[PDB]
Amino acid sequence: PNWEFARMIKEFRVTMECSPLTVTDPIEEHRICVCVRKRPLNKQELAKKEIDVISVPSKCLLLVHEPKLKVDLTKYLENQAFCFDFAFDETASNEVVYRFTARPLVQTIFEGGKATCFAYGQTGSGKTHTMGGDLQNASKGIYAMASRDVFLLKNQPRYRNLNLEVYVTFFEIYNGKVFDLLNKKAKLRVLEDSRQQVQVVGLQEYLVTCADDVIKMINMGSACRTNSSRSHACFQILLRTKGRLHGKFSLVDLAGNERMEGAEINKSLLALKECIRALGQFRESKLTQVLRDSFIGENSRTCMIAMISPGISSCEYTLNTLRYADRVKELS
Ligand SMILES: Nc1ncnc2c1ncn2[C@@H]1O[C@H](COP(=O)(O)OP(=O)(O)NP(=O)(O)O)[C@@H](O)[C@H]1O
Ligand SMILES: [Mg+2]
Predict the structure, then answer these.
(1) Is residue 127 a known part of a binding site?
(2) Which of 22, 66, 133, 203 could in theory staple to 141 by disulfide, Cβ–Cβ 3.0 to 4.6 A?
(3) CA-closest residue to ligand 1 atom 15
């Protein structure tokens, strides 16, 4: 009868009654995790007296108090509810966010898989702040934190005998072009044989043996990135043993989702969605071409973090971000 609606409702309920030990449940497969993070109102917004229209009453529920006018101009609220694996409020720090998003994926690369974590949302929603550090401070961002746990795990008995070497890369995608951020914005070439795997010729891999090393490459890369979006940022952590790639973690700082380059940005985001959904089961773009091998394997996991700016003036941008997020998790 209305089985489709019944399915959507059951999925919402299931997500609403899940325990944190769901995505972080080893011996259990969860290739796709979707979260949302609300940032607090900033100085400028508070000064302009922007109203905060976002509430996160539980760890999986986010509420949008959408301002509306009836035909006769009467003011009311259409309070909409969204459910995610994890919903973070304005008091959540980067370490807390990191703990429930990228942290559970590190093990995946040591188990020989390919993990990806994406920061998605509108311009100024907190994407760069979350992935790269507060602003500036590399150590306080997910790239750093993830690196920190990679060195801790590699020194664990279960992995010691792997004799792995840790490598890092940092590049940005701008208008279908790839630029090495660790090799002075050097423009790189992207090729794809017939067997279809992609290779980024010239991308520089740097050996790191310490978190301080990684922090030096993050500062360097962020210092010469094209703050503001306009590009896709992608910081990678690769594990190698003997000529072979053991595992790889690609952390992506996406461009704002809201000069007709927005066409390339929208195509990449449309492409990203279908690649992630294809993971739990085109019209290609550079981003999805470069990260292709991280969606095709069976031992691959991904996490999507949707950033939201709480201001009333950004309500339409928020709904757009949330609905995109819904469709992504829809494949889990
Ligand atoms: N959780 C947060 N707490 C405090 N400040 C934050 C937080 N998230 C973001 N900000 C700040 O708000 C701005 C948005 O930062 P980021 O620079 O994080 O945005 P995007 O990366 O969201 N923007 P864009 O590059 O235009 O797509 C920066 O000035 C951040 O320092
Ligand atoms: Mg940014």
Answers:
(1) yes
(2) 133
(3) 126
CATH of the domain at 6: 3.40.850.10
Q: What are phi and psi of 272, to 5 degrees?
A: -55, -50
Burial of 272 (0-12, 13-18, 19+ CB in 10 A): buried
| Resolution limit, Å | 2.2
Type and span of the H or E element at 247: strand 245-253
Q: Nearest-CA neighbor of 204 among 221, 222, 228, 226? A: 221
Pairing of strands 165-174, 114-121: unpaired
Burial of 292 (0-12, 13-18, 19+ CB in 10 A): middle
What SS3 class is residue 282?
A: coil
Q: Tell me, using a 6 A CB cutoff, whether residue 267 lines ligand 1.
A: no
Method of structure determination? X-ray
Segment (H or E) for 311: none
Long-range pairs of 44-52 with CB within 8 A, sequence gap ≥ 24: 45/310, 45/311, 50/311, 50/312, 50/313, 51/311, 51/312, 52/310, 52/311, 52/312
CB of 177 closer than 8 Å to CB of 187: yes
Task: List Cβ<8 Å contacts ≥24 apart for 156-159.
Answer: 159/110
Q: Is 125 annotated as a binding residue?
A: yes
User: What is the extent of the structural domain holding 40?
Assistant: 1-332
**66 closest CA partner among 74, 77, 55, 52:** 77
Encoding tokens for residue 53?
Answer: 């229209």
Does any ligand 1 atom lie closer than 6 A to the CB of residue 123?
yes
Q: Which runs of E-coded beta strand occur in 151-244?
A: 165-174, 177-180, 186-192, 198-201, 206-208, 232-240
What would the two tokens of residue 272 be?
């990203």
**Measured CA distances, 215 to 64, 210, 255 (Å):** 36, 9, 22
How many domains are contained in the chain? Answer: 1
Ligand nearest to the CA of 123: 1
CA atoms within a 13 Å half-sphere pointing along the CA-CB vector of 23 = 26
